[PDB]
Every structure is written in structure tokens, then in C-alpha cells.
Amino acid sequence: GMADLFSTVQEKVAGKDVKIVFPEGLDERILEAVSKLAGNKVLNPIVIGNENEIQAKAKELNLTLGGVKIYDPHTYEGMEDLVQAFVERRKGKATEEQARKALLDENYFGTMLVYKGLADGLVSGAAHSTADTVRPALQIIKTKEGVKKTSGVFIMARGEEQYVFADCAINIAPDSQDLAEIAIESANTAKMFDIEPRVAMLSFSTKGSAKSDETEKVADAVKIAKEKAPELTLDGEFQFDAAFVPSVAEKKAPDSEIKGDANVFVFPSLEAGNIGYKIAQRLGNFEAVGPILQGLNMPVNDLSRGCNAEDVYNLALITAAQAL
Amino acid sequence: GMADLFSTVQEKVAGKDVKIVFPEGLDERILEAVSKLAGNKVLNPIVIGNENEIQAKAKELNLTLGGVKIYDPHTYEGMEDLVQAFVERRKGKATEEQARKALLDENYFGTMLVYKGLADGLVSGAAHSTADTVRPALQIIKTKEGVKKTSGVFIMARGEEQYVFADCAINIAPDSQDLAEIAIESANTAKMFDIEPRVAMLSFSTKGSAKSDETEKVADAVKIAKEKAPELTLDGEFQFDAAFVPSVAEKKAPDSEIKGDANVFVFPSLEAGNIGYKIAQRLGNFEAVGPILQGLNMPVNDLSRGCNAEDVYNLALITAAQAL
């Protein structure tokens, strides 16, 4: 099912020994996943925390920290090189004493590391709010070329069915500019899982039906997106019908690239997207892969507190894929 | 499936010979439905339009207009009375010449009838925009006691599962007052189909998670509703998880009337509610009964252009139930 989908990712990732930092060094979920990732030599895990503590924790979990590297912010040699890199990146917003204090935090340390090439991607979240992960990710590592914000996609899968759901996690109330972006960036993220982009900007009316600011927003959003990325197959302001079942596509809106065959759905707002993926999951019995951030300079992803020890492993595979 | 749900309604409706007006007299969907309703003596259909025409059209669909009554705005004997009743209900907003013109419109004419007791409910929409149906319904018949607006609910059903989805059709951007309303009104409508109300005001966070205007809105809504209707089992600001799966309920928000067993979900906005019932339908493979308006003084419902001849039949059953 969804598993067939990760082996695809792990295929590209395995062997290229990509470094992924896991700030939550004492978390057994992280440890178990790290211990196994290193054990099968899929990628190079870098844990963060006190070595003696981490080592002892791994032993009570009957684990071994094989090809696993450990960095402790209170011992790390490159500190001032880092502390100085941080203050410079914060363009004055940070004193030296501040940066020093800041970098003693596992998430910030781990991010400075990804930032200075000493790691290729970060993976945290199993013991921090999603903000605490995405925060530094935005102060330090920043967004790529023509991107202004990050968004969280969700790979959805049921047997052969695989879709992407646009920003059901970060941006609360996106505007025309943002939606256009989420669409384009999601289409790129969908490439990673070997899916062929076909975006459908969702709303509560199809190409005209109801006309309010809400439908304009999405509509406007489609112009901007079609304008920026002309080749991307994406038409806009579709109800889920029009976007999902072909019969309804020709009735409500023919003469449109999307012929009721969209596989990347961009929601109009966080209220619709979050409730959306969740209904698809709990009601449609679709497997759902947690929020995957996108559009950053370097891969950074957020696990859910109470995640699975195998969720850490897979987020890791997705994160290392984004870096490759 | 859904079918059992209708026999339930038809059980209460059949025999009490309720009158339902169908303004779209020349529509074959209405004619086929009206022909059958009258055929089984379920209710008393009143079609609106030219008799010779309607009669001729019934002929080419191999229909008989048995216990079906036909009213023609251009012939109706009580028209003078109706025009005056309209001007009065339009408190000066309409001239006499204007009300006369207005009442020659099948939707307005059928609404005036419902309004003066000559019919019990109206059913239109098979050939008019949803605006054209709800318009006169709001100028003429109006909202009940303490209701300020209408909202469109959807009965959802898959096998044994039956739920109600809050305003996925009328109100674009509801506020705390409206959401609170939609919740209470939807809980009542849910009674009609023999469902035991358990409202869950949805959003993108559970009791506290994220705090923005958006979560406040819904949260505020829950106070207003619990205040107004103390006995109604409804707790608020749940993500769909919290509302749908018990495991998630005790984790994210125990000490709440809703223990992951909600069966009436009130969405925070039309973008979420419309995209929501449709994902449930096309992905969850749930059967969805089109928009059912609620809270008006007299039943008025809207079919979708391109509905089923059986969709008219069932909307009629529901509309007649709302009247009883």
C-alpha cells in the first residue's frame, strides 16, 4: 500500500549516505529508528544530546549506536564558528550571548548544522511543537529561490491510489499569492514520490458557480500559478467532484486540463485542508503520511509527538530524499 | 444503505397527504417524480405552469398526471389575493405592478402558495440557481423563531453509518453566532432522520491546540450554543480525529461530552464544509443527500440542475417530513 511507496523513496536514498540530524537524542522512537537506519546503512544518522546519556538510553532499549554520530552542544568544537554563523545570518537581531544561548538548544544546534553543510537535513518533532521545529528552520535555513513560505503536504494512499494534499498543516489563511505557490511547490514534492503532477485548486464552486472573494482568491491563484509555471497541468477553482470524478468534470467544466483526474489537490485554507486529509484518512481509509514541509533551502521535517518508531524512519527517508 | 434512511422518512410522510409545490412544471425530472408520488398516494403534488403544456409534456414521457394538481400563474383565481399579500409582506419594498410581475414567476408563485397555507412546502432548483430558490423563500416565507439564517445540511450515509454535515451549501463565511446557530438547527434536522444529536464544531485544532481568530470563532461558537441549548450534546473546536475516532478523543481532549462519537459535524466555513462532504462522498464512498435547507418558517428545498428523477422524489419526501 503506502509501504510500496516508501521502498520507492528508500530506493533513491539508500547508499548515498545522506546525513540527517535528529535533535531529540534521548527519544526512544528516534533511537530505535536511528539505530536501525545506521544498522542497514540506509543513511547516516546524527543524533544530538549528551553521549553518556544517549549511550545508556540506547542500552536499556537493547539498541546499539552503530554508524550513529553524536553531537552535544555543550562539547561541540565548531560552536563559535556556529555561534558566529548564526549572528551573521540573524543580521544583528542576535547578540553573541544570545546566539550562544540559542545554539544550546537541540533544534537550533541541529539546524545550524544542516545550514553549515555538516548535515543534509533535519528531522525533529517527536517531542516539540511543530512551531519549535519550523521556527529555526525559518530564521536560519531559509526558503528556496522563488518561495516565500513553507507549507505542509500529505502523501495520501489507498492501495494503488496516491495523491498529495496541499498545506493541511502550516499556513492558516493563505491568499492568492500563497495558494499559487503551494500548488507549484506541491507539484514538485509530488515528483519525488514518482507521481505525475495534475493540480486542482479546490473551492466550493467550480469555474464560476458561486462568486465571492473566496472563489476569486482561488481563481486569482490559478492565474498567478499558470502564469509562473505554464507547463504545470493545473486548472482552478474546482469542487472536489470536478477534480476527482471525470463524469462531473465534463459537466461542470470541460475545456480544462484537469479532466476529473487530479492527483494533487491544493486546498483554499487550513480549515479545509486539515479537516480534509483527516476525512480522507478516517473515512476513506486512506493511509496518510504526516506533514512534509517543502520549499526550504534544506530538508527539515516535523514528526508528531506520539509518532511511531517507524514514522521516524520514514520521515527520515523522505527528508533524505528531499536533500538528494 | 441510504435507501433505508428514506423509507424511514417516507414512513412518516406517506398517507398524511402533504402538499408540495414544484414550480418547475415542464421539467421531466419533476414530472416523473410528481407522476410517481401521486401514483403511490405518498403526498399531493402541485405542479406549476401551463396546463395544456404540462399535460402534453407528461404525454411524451409516458406519464399520467393522476393525483397531480396544476396551477398557472396566468389563470389562478386567487392571484389578486396573493399579489396583495406579497406587497404587504414586502412592507413597501414592492409596488403593486411589481408584485404582480413578481408573482408571475413560478418560484415566487409557488412560494406565495406555501406562505398562504395553500401548500405545505416547495421544492425547486432542478432548473434554477440555488439563489433563485432561496431568494423568495427568504423575502416571503422567512426564518423561524430565533433563527436568523438558513444553512444547508447533508445527510451522509455508508451502510450503517449516518451523519449530518453542517452548512456545506449556503453561508459562505459564518461567524460565531451563525456557527452556533447552524449547530443547533442541524441537531434538530438530524432528529428528523431518527438520529441522536452529538454535535462537534470542527476546526484545525482541538480544544486549544492552535490559537488564532479561526479557532476562537469556533470556540466562541461553542459557548453561545451550549448557552442557548444546554441539553444539546455538543463540545467544540475539534479536529476531525477528535470528533471521529474515540482513541484520539481521550488523548487530545477528554472531559468532553463528545467522546470521538460525533454524528453531526458543523464545519467552520463553506470552503471546508463543501470540500468536506464531497471528499467524504467521492473518497469515503459515502452516499450524500443534496442540500437540505433548515430553519425556515415552511419547508423549501433546492435540487441541483441535473438531478435525478429519484432525487426529486426523495427531496420531496424530506421536504414533506419537514412540514409535518
XYZ file of C-alpha atoms in Angstrom:
648
model
C 0.000 0.000 0.000
C 1.827 3.087 1.359
C 4.745 0.806 2.061
C 5.177 0.150 -1.666
C 5.549 3.942 -1.750
C 8.435 4.242 0.716
C 10.549 1.490 -0.819
C 10.443 3.769 -3.844
C 11.898 6.593 -1.758
C 14.344 4.377 0.127
C 15.461 3.196 -3.293
C 16.797 6.622 -4.227
C 18.102 7.358 -0.731
C 19.783 4.137 0.381
C 23.506 4.053 -0.230
C 24.067 7.783 -0.958
C 24.855 8.125 2.777
C 22.934 11.337 3.450
C 23.341 12.878 6.915
C 20.180 13.516 8.837
C 20.162 15.215 12.260
C 17.688 14.108 14.899
C 17.676 16.713 17.689
C 15.634 14.514 20.063
C 18.560 12.325 21.076
C 17.027 10.745 24.162
C 13.741 9.776 22.465
C 13.372 6.012 22.119
C 11.398 6.461 18.899
C 14.338 8.433 17.447
C 16.843 5.984 18.909
C 15.126 2.925 17.568
C 14.860 4.485 14.128
C 18.357 5.857 14.221
C 19.799 2.561 15.405
C 18.058 0.787 12.508
C 18.827 3.346 9.816
C 22.531 3.063 10.673
C 22.279 -0.708 11.054
C 21.103 -1.299 7.477
C 23.308 1.552 6.300
C 20.368 3.390 4.645
C 21.680 6.854 5.548
C 23.937 8.410 8.224
C 22.040 9.355 11.365
C 23.399 12.133 13.600
C 21.790 12.254 16.991
C 22.120 15.282 19.347
C 22.447 15.125 23.159
C 24.858 14.019 25.888
C 26.883 10.998 24.714
C 26.888 9.128 28.019
C 23.138 9.612 28.491
C 22.297 8.674 24.907
C 24.551 5.646 25.053
C 22.988 4.394 28.295
C 19.463 5.050 26.940
C 20.241 3.018 23.830
C 21.341 0.140 26.019
C 18.140 -0.063 28.093
C 16.289 -0.167 24.726
C 18.605 -3.049 23.716
C 19.971 -0.897 20.997
C 23.453 -0.200 19.662
C 24.501 3.101 18.264
C 26.345 1.596 15.309
C 27.093 4.021 12.494
C 25.393 6.719 14.582
C 27.151 10.049 15.270
C 26.524 12.065 18.401
C 26.962 15.849 18.826
C 26.485 17.579 22.178
C 26.021 21.356 22.051
C 27.999 21.617 25.337
C 31.071 19.933 23.816
C 30.889 20.668 20.136
C 34.130 22.148 18.809
C 32.619 24.139 15.970
C 30.487 26.127 18.403
C 31.791 29.652 17.962
C 32.156 29.051 14.253
C 28.442 28.254 14.546
C 27.583 30.969 17.087
C 29.252 33.409 14.724
C 27.439 31.964 11.660
C 24.129 32.371 13.454
C 24.602 36.023 14.474
C 25.526 36.805 10.887
C 22.525 35.034 9.491
C 20.266 36.855 12.021
C 21.638 40.162 10.642
C 22.012 41.848 14.021
C 18.827 40.557 15.520
C 21.085 38.499 17.762
C 23.779 39.381 20.291
C 26.615 36.979 20.717
C 25.440 35.979 24.180
C 22.055 35.411 22.623
C 23.234 33.248 19.742
C 25.325 31.284 22.179
C 22.254 30.639 24.357
C 20.149 29.975 21.254
C 22.522 27.364 19.862
C 22.498 25.383 23.094
C 19.001 24.275 22.037
C 18.928 20.926 20.246
C 16.662 22.135 17.455
C 18.746 25.256 16.790
C 22.030 23.352 17.067
C 20.767 20.745 14.656
C 19.658 23.456 12.301
C 22.872 25.369 12.315
C 24.474 22.007 11.481
C 22.282 21.424 8.426
C 22.906 25.062 7.482
C 26.706 24.776 7.532
C 26.811 21.577 5.460
C 27.695 19.340 8.466
C 24.341 17.541 7.904
C 21.959 17.490 4.972
C 18.548 17.561 6.623
C 16.879 17.751 9.979
C 14.069 15.677 11.488
C 12.525 16.637 14.813
C 9.025 16.885 16.282
C 8.579 13.724 18.318
C 8.933 15.898 21.464
C 8.465 19.552 20.343
C 5.549 21.585 19.000
C 5.565 21.971 15.217
C 6.453 25.629 15.671
C 9.671 24.772 17.573
C 10.869 22.843 14.548
C 9.725 25.200 11.784
C 10.839 28.284 13.716
C 14.631 27.991 13.389
C 14.093 26.361 10.036
C 12.877 29.800 9.011
C 15.248 32.088 10.866
C 18.384 30.047 9.881
C 17.851 27.812 6.830
C 15.514 29.789 4.701
C 13.155 29.255 1.769
C 14.495 28.463 -1.702
C 14.618 30.700 -4.763
C 11.143 31.959 -5.599
C 9.414 30.665 -2.496
C 8.152 32.942 0.295
C 6.650 30.412 2.716
C 6.614 26.737 3.586
C 3.549 24.534 3.500
C 2.864 21.001 4.536
C 1.826 18.388 2.024
C 0.486 14.927 2.888
C 1.002 11.951 0.684
C -2.301 10.071 0.672
C -2.544 6.480 -0.386
C -5.032 3.641 -0.621
C -3.757 0.550 -2.464
C -2.837 1.878 -5.918
C -4.281 5.371 -5.237
C -1.708 8.022 -4.369
C -2.466 11.725 -4.015
C -0.897 14.844 -2.474
C -2.863 17.265 -0.255
C -1.753 20.953 -0.209
C -0.966 22.659 3.048
C -3.054 20.966 5.645
C -0.580 21.909 8.344
C 1.287 25.226 8.279
C -0.279 28.269 6.594
C -3.643 29.174 8.252
C -5.241 31.594 5.809
C -3.290 31.585 2.503
C -4.001 34.281 -0.114
C -3.868 34.163 -3.949
C -0.055 34.513 -3.932
C 0.391 31.792 -1.330
C -2.035 29.287 -2.859
C -0.347 29.662 -6.236
C 2.938 28.898 -4.546
C 1.612 25.920 -2.553
C 0.253 24.492 -5.791
C 3.587 24.768 -7.673
C 5.746 23.583 -4.769
C 3.410 20.652 -4.040
C 3.608 19.568 -7.642
C 7.358 19.414 -7.205
C 7.127 17.449 -3.977
C 4.769 15.063 -5.748
C 7.521 14.367 -8.277
C 9.700 12.942 -5.511
C 7.237 10.037 -4.994
C 7.163 9.377 -8.759
C 3.718 10.987 -9.258
C 2.785 12.951 -12.356
C 1.568 16.467 -11.329
C -2.005 17.436 -12.085
C -3.031 20.154 -9.730
C -6.607 21.105 -8.923
C -7.104 24.268 -6.859
C -10.115 23.361 -4.700
C -13.011 25.612 -3.627
C -16.752 25.384 -3.022
C -17.677 26.115 -6.611
C -16.343 25.047 -9.985
C -15.024 27.578 -12.543
C -17.709 30.204 -11.893
C -20.566 28.528 -9.892
C -20.560 30.864 -6.863
C -18.724 34.177 -6.989
C -17.427 35.622 -3.738
C -13.981 36.726 -2.557
C -13.252 33.140 -1.578
C -13.774 31.845 -5.107
C -11.874 34.852 -6.520
C -8.891 34.076 -4.278
C -8.538 30.567 -5.654
C -9.369 31.721 -9.165
C -6.779 34.509 -8.980
C -4.399 31.945 -7.533
C -4.754 29.764 -10.633
C -3.817 32.709 -12.911
C -0.689 33.508 -10.973
C 0.310 29.794 -10.919
C -0.476 29.209 -14.597
C 1.452 32.392 -15.264
C 4.566 31.419 -13.269
C 4.584 27.729 -14.253
C 2.992 27.427 -17.773
C 3.782 23.715 -18.220
C 2.326 22.567 -14.881
C -1.004 20.869 -15.586
C -3.305 22.782 -13.247
C -6.710 24.325 -13.701
C -8.521 26.142 -10.964
C -11.429 26.692 -8.724
C -12.782 23.125 -8.709
C -15.127 21.434 -6.315
C -13.768 18.080 -5.213
C -16.198 16.480 -7.713
C -14.860 18.217 -10.704
C -11.392 17.418 -9.516
C -11.946 13.737 -8.651
C -14.602 12.116 -10.914
C -14.384 12.541 -14.783
C -18.171 12.364 -15.306
C -18.548 15.585 -13.258
C -15.520 17.166 -14.935
C -17.093 17.373 -18.425
C -20.438 18.513 -16.981
C -19.290 21.289 -14.608
C -16.193 22.389 -16.519
C -14.899 20.903 -19.753
C -12.174 22.666 -21.723
C -9.907 22.276 -18.749
C -6.586 20.491 -18.351
C -7.880 18.609 -15.324
C -10.360 16.090 -16.645
C -11.582 14.810 -13.295
C -8.124 13.233 -12.883
C -6.331 15.484 -10.395
C -3.754 13.826 -8.149
C -2.519 16.898 -6.289
C -5.262 18.840 -4.508
C -4.493 22.342 -3.208
C -6.944 23.364 -0.520
C -8.055 27.010 -0.149
C -7.478 27.227 3.599
C -6.037 25.373 6.588
C -9.600 24.713 7.881
C -10.442 22.861 4.670
C -7.097 21.118 4.255
C -6.646 19.872 7.778
C -10.203 18.632 8.045
C -9.801 17.352 4.533
C -6.895 14.944 4.761
C -8.348 13.752 8.018
C -11.687 12.876 6.472
C -9.923 11.165 3.618
C -7.991 9.187 6.234
C -10.537 8.212 8.890
C -13.449 7.908 6.442
C -11.880 6.963 3.123
C -9.491 4.578 4.904
C -6.547 6.255 3.218
C -3.097 5.920 4.670
C -1.762 9.435 5.440
C 1.947 10.426 5.640
C 2.355 13.245 8.217
C 3.175 16.843 7.387
C 6.086 17.070 4.962
C 7.429 20.658 4.781
C 8.524 21.951 1.387
C 10.309 24.817 -0.306
C 13.064 25.298 2.252
C 16.792 25.587 1.361
C 17.495 22.334 3.197
C 15.172 19.460 4.174
C 13.514 19.882 7.551
C 10.546 17.809 8.650
C 8.237 17.558 11.631
C 7.102 14.347 13.346
C 4.065 14.276 15.595
C 4.591 13.881 19.357
C 3.315 10.386 19.928
C 4.605 9.285 16.497
C 5.664 5.769 15.584
C 9.204 4.450 15.797
C 8.647 3.585 12.146
C 7.311 7.027 11.394
C 10.712 8.481 12.350
C 12.328 6.013 9.985
C 10.075 7.015 7.063
C 10.122 10.712 7.727
C 13.892 10.218 7.634
C 13.680 8.537 4.211
C 11.523 11.401 2.912
C 13.805 14.023 4.402
C 16.945 12.458 2.939
C 15.144 12.240 -0.421
C 14.427 15.974 -0.424
C 18.148 16.584 0.193
C 19.336 14.308 -2.617
C -27.807 1.906 2.861
C -29.184 5.447 2.343
C -32.280 3.806 0.959
C -33.266 2.561 4.441
C -32.899 6.093 5.614
C -35.586 7.280 3.177
C -38.110 4.535 3.933
C -37.846 5.954 7.456
C -38.865 9.380 6.216
C -41.482 8.064 3.718
C -42.864 6.127 6.644
C -43.756 9.343 8.477
C -44.796 11.206 5.296
C -46.910 8.695 3.383
C -50.641 8.951 3.924
C -50.730 12.342 5.662
C -51.217 13.806 2.159
C -48.990 16.852 2.484
C -48.993 19.288 -0.431
C -45.674 20.048 -2.058
C -45.299 22.657 -4.845
C -42.911 22.056 -7.679
C -42.546 25.365 -9.560
C -40.666 23.686 -12.486
C -43.734 22.261 -14.223
C -42.187 21.404 -17.568
C -39.171 19.585 -16.157
C -39.193 15.860 -16.878
C -37.428 15.131 -13.626
C -40.177 16.870 -11.738
C -42.893 15.383 -13.898
C -41.562 11.810 -13.470
C -41.226 12.318 -9.744
C -44.556 14.102 -9.388
C -46.197 11.409 -11.501
C -44.872 8.714 -9.165
C -45.542 10.497 -5.882
C -49.153 10.945 -6.907
C -49.129 7.406 -8.287
C -48.480 5.839 -4.872
C -50.502 8.440 -2.959
C -47.393 9.306 -0.863
C -48.144 13.005 -0.882
C -50.160 15.523 -3.004
C -48.035 17.153 -5.696
C -48.938 20.550 -7.077
C -47.109 21.368 -10.309
C -46.923 24.995 -11.558
C -47.129 26.057 -15.261
C -49.480 25.995 -18.297
C -51.921 23.023 -18.089
C -52.035 22.136 -21.798
C -48.257 22.300 -21.967
C -47.597 20.293 -18.827
C -50.253 17.857 -19.946
C -48.596 17.494 -23.370
C -45.145 17.055 -21.901
C -46.389 14.389 -19.487
C -47.702 12.619 -22.598
C -44.347 12.422 -24.294
C -42.695 10.988 -21.160
C -45.470 8.319 -20.963
C -46.766 9.840 -17.792
C -50.222 10.440 -16.434
C -50.888 13.345 -14.153
C -53.123 11.399 -11.755
C -53.493 12.977 -8.346
C -51.387 15.931 -9.522
C -52.767 19.467 -9.317
C -51.717 22.123 -11.842
C -51.652 25.887 -11.074
C -50.967 28.548 -13.734
C -49.930 31.999 -12.507
C -51.761 33.410 -15.560
C -55.059 31.741 -14.573
C -55.023 31.268 -10.850
C -58.233 32.687 -9.388
C -56.719 33.707 -6.041
C -53.960 35.775 -7.664
C -55.375 39.130 -6.707
C -55.286 37.985 -3.113
C -51.735 36.726 -3.480
C -50.428 39.966 -5.019
C -51.745 41.961 -2.092
C -50.295 39.516 0.439
C -46.937 39.935 -1.202
C -46.903 43.747 -1.207
C -47.781 43.616 2.467
C -45.126 41.056 3.293
C -42.689 43.223 1.306
C -43.521 46.102 3.652
C -43.486 48.734 0.924
C -40.422 47.407 -0.889
C -42.764 46.302 -3.696
C -45.299 48.275 -5.786
C -48.434 46.609 -6.947
C -47.237 46.496 -10.533
C -44.030 44.970 -9.219
C -45.664 42.315 -7.043
C -47.865 41.310 -9.935
C -44.886 40.898 -12.239
C -43.084 39.069 -9.446
C -45.880 36.635 -8.822
C -45.960 35.523 -12.419
C -42.636 33.737 -11.682
C -43.097 30.071 -10.895
C -40.721 30.203 -7.881
C -42.381 33.291 -6.398
C -45.865 31.986 -7.187
C -45.157 28.630 -5.614
C -43.650 30.385 -2.574
C -46.655 32.625 -2.095
C -48.741 29.439 -2.097
C -46.656 27.782 0.578
C -46.822 31.044 2.537
C -50.629 31.304 2.487
C -51.234 27.692 3.503
C -52.395 26.584 0.041
C -49.367 24.237 0.013
C -47.076 22.916 2.702
C -43.595 23.041 1.189
C -41.881 23.927 -2.030
C -39.222 22.054 -3.991
C -37.402 23.707 -6.811
C -33.882 24.075 -8.192
C -33.895 21.471 -10.978
C -33.771 24.381 -13.395
C -32.818 27.495 -11.423
C -29.736 28.531 -9.480
C -29.832 27.870 -5.743
C -30.078 31.613 -5.312
C -33.397 31.825 -7.184
C -34.941 29.233 -4.870
C -33.663 30.564 -1.542
C -34.361 34.193 -2.569
C -38.184 34.321 -2.443
C -38.014 31.742 0.289
C -36.316 34.499 2.282
C -38.248 37.574 1.115
C -41.631 35.848 1.550
C -41.551 32.817 3.900
C -38.942 33.735 6.429
C -36.823 32.153 9.163
C -38.426 30.577 12.244
C -38.401 31.917 15.801
C -34.821 32.539 16.951
C -33.072 31.726 13.690
C -31.520 34.442 11.605
C -30.286 32.490 8.593
C -30.651 29.217 6.720
C -27.999 26.639 6.289
C -27.748 23.573 4.098
C -27.151 20.223 5.820
C -26.291 16.933 4.096
C -27.305 13.571 5.358
C -24.297 11.278 4.857
C -24.545 7.501 4.895
C -22.496 4.419 4.206
C -24.043 1.109 5.119
C -24.842 1.512 8.813
C -23.070 4.920 9.243
C -25.224 8.046 9.195
C -24.039 11.601 9.769
C -25.152 15.173 9.151
C -22.801 17.763 7.657
C -23.228 21.432 8.659
C -23.680 24.102 6.060
C -21.814 22.876 3.091
C -24.056 24.899 0.715
C -25.443 28.340 1.750
C -23.446 30.528 4.256
C -20.014 31.419 2.863
C -18.190 32.801 5.924
C -20.175 32.132 9.140
C -19.248 33.831 12.414
C -19.569 32.578 15.963
C -23.292 33.477 16.051
C -24.001 31.699 12.792
C -21.933 28.604 13.602
C -23.679 28.320 16.985
C -26.972 28.568 15.093
C -26.035 26.080 12.341
C -25.098 23.628 15.120
C -28.401 23.798 16.995
C -30.503 23.841 13.831
C -28.559 20.922 12.319
C -29.083 18.934 15.511
C -32.818 19.366 15.078
C -32.797 18.397 11.386
C -30.775 15.356 12.416
C -33.750 14.339 14.581
C -35.969 14.034 11.526
C -33.899 11.114 10.234
C -34.082 9.452 13.649
C -30.504 10.330 14.595
C -29.450 11.169 18.177
C -27.638 14.557 18.069
C -23.980 14.825 19.107
C -22.527 17.966 17.547
C -18.826 18.578 17.127
C -17.847 22.040 15.935
C -14.892 21.270 13.688
C -11.698 23.345 13.061
C -7.956 22.688 12.529
C -7.153 22.254 16.241
C -8.672 20.510 19.258
C -9.667 22.416 22.392
C -6.659 24.712 22.483
C -4.032 23.279 20.060
C -3.671 26.384 17.861
C -4.941 29.789 18.894
C -5.917 32.184 16.154
C -9.076 34.075 15.275
C -10.169 30.963 13.407
C -10.082 28.677 16.410
C -11.573 31.391 18.576
C -14.526 31.775 16.205
C -15.472 28.120 16.581
C -14.635 28.081 20.302
C -16.821 31.180 20.838
C -19.488 29.478 18.821
C -19.465 26.573 21.260
C -20.148 28.868 24.220
C -23.061 30.573 22.505
C -24.566 27.206 21.507
C -24.042 25.462 24.874
C -25.521 28.633 26.426
C -28.556 28.707 24.144
C -29.052 24.918 24.086
C -27.759 23.403 27.383
C -29.091 19.876 26.803
C -27.692 19.535 23.285
C -24.639 17.244 23.482
C -22.019 19.344 21.687
C -18.465 20.181 22.565
C -16.318 22.368 20.414
C -13.244 23.111 18.419
C -12.369 19.533 17.458
C -10.168 18.342 14.622
C -11.918 15.592 12.658
C -9.846 12.974 14.563
C -11.136 14.117 17.924
C -14.647 14.103 16.572
C -14.457 10.830 14.745
C -12.156 8.309 16.486
C -12.511 7.601 20.288
C -8.809 6.830 20.765
C -7.989 10.343 19.611
C -10.746 11.787 21.800
C -9.307 10.802 25.194
C -5.811 11.810 24.119
C -6.470 15.255 22.622
C -9.500 16.284 24.712
C -11.093 14.078 27.371
C -13.595 15.629 29.780
C -15.725 16.485 26.794
C -19.260 15.316 26.029
C -18.020 14.264 22.603
C -16.028 11.085 23.065
C -14.970 10.633 19.435
C -18.620 9.774 18.697
C -19.980 12.851 16.908
C -22.643 12.316 14.241
C -23.433 15.916 13.326
C -20.367 17.816 12.219
C -20.510 21.585 11.957
C -17.833 22.964 9.654
C -16.168 26.352 10.254
C -16.703 27.646 6.737
C -18.204 26.932 3.320
C -14.780 26.137 1.804
C -14.296 23.451 4.448
C -17.854 22.130 4.503
C -18.402 21.854 0.780
C -14.966 20.321 0.062
C -15.637 18.215 3.156
C -18.919 16.474 2.239
C -17.598 15.871 -1.261
C -14.371 14.218 -0.110
C -16.470 12.064 2.224
C -18.635 11.150 -0.786
C -16.117 10.531 -3.632
C -13.325 9.185 -1.392
C -15.209 7.712 1.519
C -17.757 6.257 -0.865
C -20.497 7.751 1.289
C -23.976 8.419 -0.101
C -24.843 12.118 0.242
C -28.339 13.605 0.207
C -28.079 17.067 -1.544
C -28.539 20.436 0.265
C -31.461 20.318 2.761
C -32.216 23.914 3.961
C -33.257 24.358 7.591
C -34.816 26.817 9.987
C -37.285 28.489 7.568
C -40.962 29.030 8.539
C -42.036 26.476 5.909
C -40.089 23.752 4.062
C -38.260 24.932 0.975
C -35.591 22.803 -0.669
C -33.215 23.041 -3.588
C -32.366 20.320 -6.130
C -29.271 20.612 -8.333
C -29.775 21.264 -12.051
C -29.095 17.854 -13.489
C -30.531 15.956 -10.548
C -32.075 12.512 -10.683
C -35.755 11.928 -11.222
C -35.447 9.962 -7.985
C -33.529 12.844 -6.375
C -36.668 14.980 -6.814
C -38.695 12.125 -5.322
C -36.588 11.956 -2.168
C -36.165 15.691 -1.693
C -39.939 15.766 -1.760
C -40.101 13.108 0.973
C -37.681 15.118 3.122
C -39.482 18.417 2.449
C -42.822 16.886 3.354
C -41.275 15.493 6.550
C -40.014 18.998 7.480
C -43.608 20.201 7.134
C -45.241 17.520 9.234
